[PDB]
Design a protein around this ligand. Structure first.
Ligand SMILES: *[C@@H]1O[C@H](CO)[C@@H](O[C@@H]2O[C@H](CO)[C@@H](O)[C@H](O)[C@H]2NC(C)=O)[C@H](O)[C@H]1NC(C)=O
Ligand SMILES: *[C@@H]1O[C@H](CO)[C@@H](O[C@@H]2O[C@H](CO)[C@@H](O)[C@H](O)[C@H]2NC(C)=O)[C@H](O)[C@H]1NC(C)=O
Ligand SMILES: [Zn+2]
Ligand SMILES: [Zn+2]
Ligand SMILES: [Zn+2]
Ligand SMILES: [Zn+2]
Ligand SMILES: [Zn+2]
Ligand SMILES: [Zn+2]
Ligand SMILES: [Zn+2]
Ligand SMILES: [Zn+2]
Ligand SMILES: [Zn+2]
Ligand SMILES: [Zn+2]
Lengths: 106, 198, 106, 196
């Protein structure tokens, strides 16, 4: 709850029950976006115009409008070996959208 | 159940992140059924028709296909006299419920000389590419493998096939996406939502 | 705190002090994304793989890991008349990113 | 800021079914004006209009308009008529002696005038050269000559500085070379500056 930034998040597929179809890896670094999008929004959170507007509106009317949320911007792919819906073993070098590359306010 | 070949491919891809592979998508297809005919005087070689269920999504563009076979002299006595021969795989176009090789229409894929007992890799990309664009008409999605034993070798030189349970043939299909990952990640998402409530 | 969805949000530039450079319009519909990204995440929130993963992780470790945030997806442009830093009057038919087109969980 | 820009805004918003050709529009008022009265040698009003047009390198302009206010300048016997012509030149080389009677000019637009009011001159070519300045020759200015005809006003002219009403100004229509990519990037940075 300070500044929107990427934090460590190790995800074990056994824990979330995805070990039933995910063959590899057993666990991976997915990362997490923590912190708030407090005024002002700087370059380092890649804000949108709406985010800036909403933040100012929230600053003006905090009881009616909430502030922008700290969410992942671009996501990084990982290598994944898994079984298809048909049970077919499938390996993908770029399984897009599994881990956080950058964070930001939206 | 998932072949260690697939597991090793993962380990290869992950330990060598500095060297990106030519193909992103890799799938393993084990043999569905096998029709085996022993060598005859008319046709002095082992005949195998291997039926698969290769199904690659239309929006995907496959690049390579591998047929993995286990070549072995079937525990014959005096097999120590040598183990050497050759094998040929044909893409079956038109089949016929009579004999193997001795009937139907085939289009030749790969000729392979064999020496070591173990797994062989056959570049049969053409056949699967033809199977993807099925266009109904001629029923395919299957191929014929012949195993030719040479003179100073085993009379029972063959590939391990069903109804055996060990070292069975399987396909390894390498593929990329035509839509450059757009339609790919869309369906991956829809599938994952299914695995979400799983 | 129900379902991630687009809600109405009227923004007056006078209120947020942007009347100093924004000439037109005086106010516009910017919209806002309200609601929570509760399990399970459906198609209507266009979730990412990370969002799905984190949501499942949240179920397992709610005290350590938070759930996905309801944020704007794609943004719609509006027509804006304004003065440059040099004081130059500027009109742009597509002033991108001013209002919410779709919402989703990230 | 001219109401011409405001009306353009209203035009864009009321006609959502009809998208305009240009996204970016800017208004540039005249910075300075050098006026020379008609002589027997050169029987017409001469005006050198100095502007400060500065369009970002990453932008590709499409059209430029020079808006002038044609009016009989409160002369006695002004009911005798208002009719003539006017010509705008892109000034390459100027000279602090006379106007028109010196320097190097490139003819832009010839305009016949009748009604008292605003006239629009399509002088896109001149501004495009101003954008690609390439240092060297000092430009960013143009010369407008106003020719009064026989049966017309003796003081037929355009309203210019040091006058305070109906002064000349530029209207530059522009788009982005990166098709809006680099544009919205800088718009964001601009907004962040205006944020705090
Ligand atoms: C061989 O593979 C095909 C395609 O992968 C399978 O076709 C499926 O048929 C079922 C019928 O209930 C459909 O619900 C599926 O959607 C089909 N698959 C696809 C990818 O669309 C076929 O079942 C497989 N054959 C066997 C014997 O399993
Ligand atoms: C006229 O426009 C020019 C831009 O071409 C302005 O010059 C800029 O002035 C700022 C601040 O003085 C400098 O940081 C820039 O480097 C200048 N740009 C160039 C290209 O020189 C100038 O200030 C404007 N003048 C008026 C009166 O509007
Ligand atoms: Zn040979
Ligand atoms: Zn024998
Ligand atoms: Zn796919
Ligand atoms: Zn919860
Ligand atoms: Zn647009
Ligand atoms: Zn004379
Ligand atoms: Zn005339
Ligand atoms: Zn004429
Ligand atoms: Zn007369
Ligand atoms: Zn720009």
């Amino acid at each position: 709850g300070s500044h929107c930034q990427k934090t460590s998040l190790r995800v074990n597929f056994e824990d979330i029950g995805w070990d039933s179809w995910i063959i590899a890896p057993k666990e991976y670094e997915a990362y997490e976006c923590k912190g708030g999008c407090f005024f002002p929004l700087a370059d380092d959170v890649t804000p949108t115009k709406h985010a800036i507007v909403q933040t100012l509106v929230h600053l003006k009317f905090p009881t009616k409008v909430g502030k922008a949320c700290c969410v992942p911007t671009k996501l990084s792919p990982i290598s994944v070996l898994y079984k298809d819906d048909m049970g077919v073993p499938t390996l993908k070098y770029h399984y897009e959208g599994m881990s956080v590359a950058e964070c930001g306010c939206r | 159940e998932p072949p260690q070949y697939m597991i090793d491919l993962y380990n290869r891809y992950t330990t060598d992140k500095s060297s990106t592979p030519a193909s992103n998508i890799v799938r393993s297809f084990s043999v569905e059924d096998a029709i085996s005919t022993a060598a005859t005087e008319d046709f002095p070689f082992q005949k195998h028709i291997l039926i698969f269920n290769i199904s690659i999504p239309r929006h995907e563009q496959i690049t390579r296909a591998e047929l993995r076979l286990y070549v072995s002299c079937q525990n014959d006595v005096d097999s120590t006299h040598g183990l050497e021969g050759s094998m040929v795989v044909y893409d079956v176009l038109e089949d016929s419920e009579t004999w193997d090789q001795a009937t139907g229409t085939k289009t030749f894929l790969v000729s392979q000389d064999i020496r070591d007992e173990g797994w062989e890799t056959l570049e049969v990309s053409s056949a699967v590419k033809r199977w993807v664009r099925a266009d109904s008409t001629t029923n395919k999605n299957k191929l014929e493998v012949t195993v030719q034993s040479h003179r100073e070798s085993c009379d029972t030189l063959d590939i391990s096939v069903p109804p055996g349970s060990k070292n069975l043939p399987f396909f390894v299909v390498f593929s990329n996406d035509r839509s450059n990952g757009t339609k790919e990640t869309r369906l991956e998402l829809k599938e994952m939502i299914g695995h979400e409530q799983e």
